[PDB]
Chains A and B, each alone.
With several copies, the nearest count.
Chain A
Amino acid sequence: PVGISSMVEAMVSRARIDARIDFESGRIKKEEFAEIMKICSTIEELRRQ
């Protein structure tokens, strides 16, 4: 692979985009999406410390 971002910075964005796409066009419960993104923001606050 090729990329200057950290592993976590790429993984979080990929998870968020995948959640968006399989929520809108695909089929997933909004609560599962919300928990995905709350854990993602938890990591966002965690990778800063």
Chain B
Amino acid sequence: MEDFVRQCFNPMIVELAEKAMKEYGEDLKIETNKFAAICTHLEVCFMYSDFHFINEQGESIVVELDDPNALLKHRFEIIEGRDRTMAWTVVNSICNTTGAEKPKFLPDLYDYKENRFIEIGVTRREVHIYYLEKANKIKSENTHIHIFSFTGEEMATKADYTLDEESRARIKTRLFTIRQEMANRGLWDSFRQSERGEETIEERFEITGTMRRLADQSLPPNFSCLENFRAYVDGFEPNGYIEGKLSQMSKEVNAKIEPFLKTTPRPIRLPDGPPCFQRSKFLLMDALKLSIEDPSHEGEGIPLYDAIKCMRTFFGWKEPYIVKPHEKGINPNYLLSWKQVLAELQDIENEEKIPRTKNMKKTSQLKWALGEPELRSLSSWIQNEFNKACELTDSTWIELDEIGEDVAPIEYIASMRRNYFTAEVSHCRATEYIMKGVYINTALLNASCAAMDDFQLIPMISKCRTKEGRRKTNLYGFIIKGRSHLRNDTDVVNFVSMEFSLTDPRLEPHKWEKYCVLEIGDMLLRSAIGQMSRPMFLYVRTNGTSKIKMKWGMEMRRCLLQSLQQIESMIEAESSVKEKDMTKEFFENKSETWPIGESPKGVEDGSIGKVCRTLLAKSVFNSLYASPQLEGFSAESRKLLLVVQALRDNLEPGTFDLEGLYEAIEECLINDPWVLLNASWFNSFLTHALR
């Protein structure tokens, strides 16, 4: 507000209003609207009085900028531009010289031709009421009233617009432009302030009863009226009350530093009890593929018929032989549902029209399959699952799209980093896992919209390319969807997973607790010694998912980015200490080994690609086994890792309540196998850190 007022006016009117505001203790920092109103008043008076001279006879004329050649009587005497005393003095002088009764209220200008007392008022409200109020306050005296507003209207006394037409229209236009200018500047605030006759007031905010009653109840336990508290706050003395309060407070309230040496860290307490089973959404290592090696061009290859030509590639379906029950619930319903699956699969050729999506019949076994904490100790298999996730495979699983030309400075470096990472990561099994989750969740979501009422059959299909460079389509199994009336994103949709595999649950029975296993057939199996013909199994489980559960899983490719950057992070900081950055020396130096394993009671350091795929698989399992327990464990183990790292740099660190941190960590170690694997990893890390 203030800067704009100082912008659209000459510094003389600004100085006049600034001096005129020091008159009644009216601080200009607060009464800025009064500042604008007074500046407007003064410029209105000036542009009203300018260029009006009195001819040698008794009439007024107009002139250019200025030329006081023998004629100086301005036809108008300015009053408001002067001080109070000088204004009254000039008013008395002209009243005694002319014989006109001086007004009791201070006027702002005086005319000579009509010998009238012209007083002008600039208002924002309706001009009619302002004129009526100015008349009711000043009446019965020969004093002419002239009222302007920003809207363009104008009101004089008895239609006596005692000026020229254009010389007054100039004031109308200037006021109108000021109105518009403060409008598009958001400064039409003064509508509620000058709307009082007294054009100075600012918005006063009242606090009346039934509200002050809450203000009076919000004070500390010493007062009754909040005004007492405000006056108490107005006068405050920084006398040193803190020292008295400290001497008054007990000495036991203290931040006692407990030292942190390599003897203090004790290994993490681990839960004991039943072994932790698998809660992952789909099978990772035990599921096996049903290849078709088809260059179908992925032209939105209809995902159902791809699965039936998967089935066309395997023969030797034994009679469904239930092997492992659920240990609770109707186990044969799963195999009955499987028989229904095979029937409705082979019942398509009886239909005059192929449907692209088979809506399963509302069978009672399928109705039951869709439904229409304890301390679990760590198990031995999650490490093996992660190991097989870190292993290299035969396929590629990536379509990494092109990128522009390689201009010189950093794009060369960016290239020789990312392409090295891709070549060391493309053939990883975790890439297959990511693509698998992507395909399954994408098909599930795209079906969850159009199949809002009926059960749809969604094949767990992936695609890849073996080293011979030929496109291959893989089948992991089928999934039966419940009803998908997804009103919200937390709406639950149940599903049943039936996945092919070659791993017998009879080896590790506790792992498949949420699973019913059906010996489903026999397949040709090649080994180190010819064929073996190992049995093909079907793992069936019942679970639920929601829209957020799928979308976190349709965005799983971040696990590459999150890997690369968390690799690239290491390639920046440790390489920041270099005139010419160490970027190629990171790779191509096989002597530099990275500690990643401990089999023989000793640190087993590996090569670099093992590290790249290890971090990728870490991100993959963090995404698929995503659990708030892992979140809390990571958040609470970062602190102990940082303390250990600061000790490794020998910076004499310390804590306050390390037992409290141990308590907080043990509070989030219950049943998730991924969290427990990370915990045992961390214990082994503390063991091998000279601690």
Q: Which residues of B contact A2 (CB under 8 A)?
A: 180, 183-184
Provide the residues of chain A in CB contact with B184, threshold 8 Å: 2
Contacts of A3 in B (CB 8 A): 183
Report whether over half of chain B's contact residues are helix, strand or loop; otherwise say mixed: helix
Residues of chain B in range 168-185 having any CB-CB distance to chain A below 8 Å: 179-180, 183-184
Contact with B along A1-21 (1 / 0, CB 8 A): 011100000000000000000
Q: Which residue of A lies closest to B184 (CB)?
A: A2
**Does any Cβ of A come within 8 Å of B162's Cβ?**
no
6 pairs, CB–CB < 8 Å, chain A vs chain B: A2-B180, A2-B183, A2-B184, A3-B183, A4-B151, A4-B179
The residues of A with any CB-CB pair to B shorter than 8 Å are: 2-4
How distant is B582 from chain A, measured CB to nearest CB, in Å?
A: 60
In the complex, which residues of chain A have a beta carbon less than 8 angstroms from the beta carbon of B183?
2-3
Q: Which residues of A contact B179 (CB under 8 A)?
A: 4
A2 nearest CB neighbor, chain B only: B183
Residues of A within 8 Å of B151, CB to CB, are: 4
List of 6 A-B pairs having minimum Cβ-Cβ separation, nearest first? A2-B183, A2-B184, A2-B180, A4-B151, A4-B179, A3-B183
Q: Which residue of A lies closest to B180 (CB)?
A: A2
A4 nearest CB neighbor, chain B only: B151
Contacts of A4 in B (CB 8 A): 151, 179
CB distance from A13 to the nearest CB of B (A): 15
Which residues of A sit under 8 angstroms from B180, Cβ to Cβ? 2
Query: Could you tell me the distance in whole angstroms from the C-beta of B126 to the nearest C-beta in chain A?
Result: 12
- Least CB distance from B195 to A in Å reads 14
B561 to chain A, nearest CB (A): 45
Residue of B nearest to A1 (CB): B184
Q: Separation in Å of the A7 CB from the closest CB of chain B? A: 15
Select from chain A the residue with minimum beta-carbon distance to B176: A4
Which residue of chain A lies nearest to B181 when distances are taken between CB atoms in the complex?
A2
> Digit string of B152-180 for contact with A (CB within 8 Å is 1, else 0)?
00000000000000000000000000011
Q: Which of B604-663 contact A (CB under 8 A)?
A: none
Closest Cβ–Cβ distance, residue B189 to chain A (whole Å) = 15
In whole Å, how far is A1's beta carbon from the nearest beta carbon of chain B?
Answer: 9
Name the distance in Å between B571's Cβ and chain A's nearest Cβ. 54
Residue in B closest to A5 when the chains form the complex, CB atoms: B151
Q: In whole Å, how far is B124's beta carbon from the nearest beta carbon of chain A?
A: 10
- A-facing residues in B252-283 (Cβ within 8 Å): none
Closest to B182 in A: A2
Chain A nearest Cβ from B202, distance in angstroms: 22
B187 to chain A, nearest CB (A): 11
Expressed in whole angstroms, the minimum distance between the Cβ of B175 and any Cβ of chain A is 12
* Cβ of B656 to closest chain A Cβ, rounded Å: 61
Bits for B232-250, please: 1 = Cβ < 8 Å to A, else 0: 0000000000000000000
